[PDB]
Amino acid sequence: MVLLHKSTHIFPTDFASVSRAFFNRYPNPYSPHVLSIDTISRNVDQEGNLRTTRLLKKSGKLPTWVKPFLRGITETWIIEVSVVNPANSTMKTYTRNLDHTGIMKVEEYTTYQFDSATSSTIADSRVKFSSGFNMGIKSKVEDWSRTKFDENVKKSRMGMAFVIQKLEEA
Amino acid sequence: SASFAPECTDLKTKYDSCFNEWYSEKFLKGKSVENECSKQWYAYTTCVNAALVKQGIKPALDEAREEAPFE
């Protein structure tokens, strides 16, 4: 079983503000379940780009019906990979859960892109929910996925909004 | 902002601070590519990897680190 969702947001801000905010996303009031975040590797590659790999721990609560079948999981590790191209004002981000992969795998691609004409930063997101080990009828899995996608669209966009405002407020 | 291993948190902050200044003033202005934050990074990353060795998540991470999703 596979589900894909696409969203798009326009930050009316410059690439520097938006990217610096991405790296400084946490903590923020829209992401209380995020317990930690650590930078695993970071370096400049041969084309001038900044490659970052970060590691997040996030708490969660499964929906109740699933609970007997599972398997007592609260927390999840998430890997975050990113490339910053300063000559194009382009940032590419990819996240995914590191664990509970066999149950449910949730990948996200977000592209931040500065559009000089509109003086704004376009962020396009694609989120991929993959699940073999179906366990339960998909519709609840599909609904669970719709609910989580919609919740993280608002959470990430409000969280980024917030962080950008407060970083400029200095 | 906390590290998964609390005893690393303070080494993280000082790394982050430094990088925050390097990123905004040097990197995006196209001035610098140099890792001006050498020792903050080294201290931090040392602490964090020592913390990681005791962690079950670490082989998943080591395998994940060798994927290049923007392929």
Swiss-Prot record, chain A:
Changing F23D: Strongly impairs interaction with MDM35. Failure to complement the mitochondrial defects of UPS1-deficient cells. Changing H33E: Failure to complement the mitochondrial defects of UPS1-deficient cells. GO terms for cellular component: mitochondrial inner membrane; mitochondrial intermembrane space; mitochondrion. GO terms for molecular function: lipid binding; phosphatidic acid transfer activity. Changing R42D: Impairs interaction with MDM35. Reduces ability to complement the mitochondrial defects of UPS1-deficient cells. Residues 1-80 are annotated as: Required for mitochondrial targeting. Residues 2-170 form the PRELI/MSF1 domain. One of its GO terms (biological process) is phospholipid transport. Changing W65A: Decreases phosphatidic acid binding and impairs cardiolipin biosynthesis. Belongs to the slowmo family. Interacts with MDM35. Found associated with a 170 kDa complex. This is Protein UPS1, mitochondrial. It comes from Saccharomyces cerevisiae (strain ATCC 204508 / S288c) (Baker's yeast). The gene is UPS1.
From Swiss-Prot, chain B:
Disulfide bonds join C8-C47, C18-C37. Residues 5-55 form the CHCH domain. GO terms for biological process: intermembrane lipid transfer; mitochondrial respiratory chain complex assembly; mitochondrion organization; phospholipid translocation; phospholipid transport. It is found in: Cytoplasm; Nucleus; Mitochondrion intermembrane space. It comes from the Eukaryota. Belongs to the TRIAP1/MDM35 family. Interacts with UPS1, UPS2 and UPS3. Present with 3870 molecules/cell in log phase SD medium. This is Mitochondrial distribution and morphology protein 35. It comes from Saccharomyces cerevisiae (strain ATCC 204508 / S288c) (Baker's yeast). The lineage of its organism: Eukaryota, Fungi, Dikarya, Ascomycota, Saccharomycotina. The gene is MDM35. The chain holds residues 6 to 76 of 86 of the full protein.
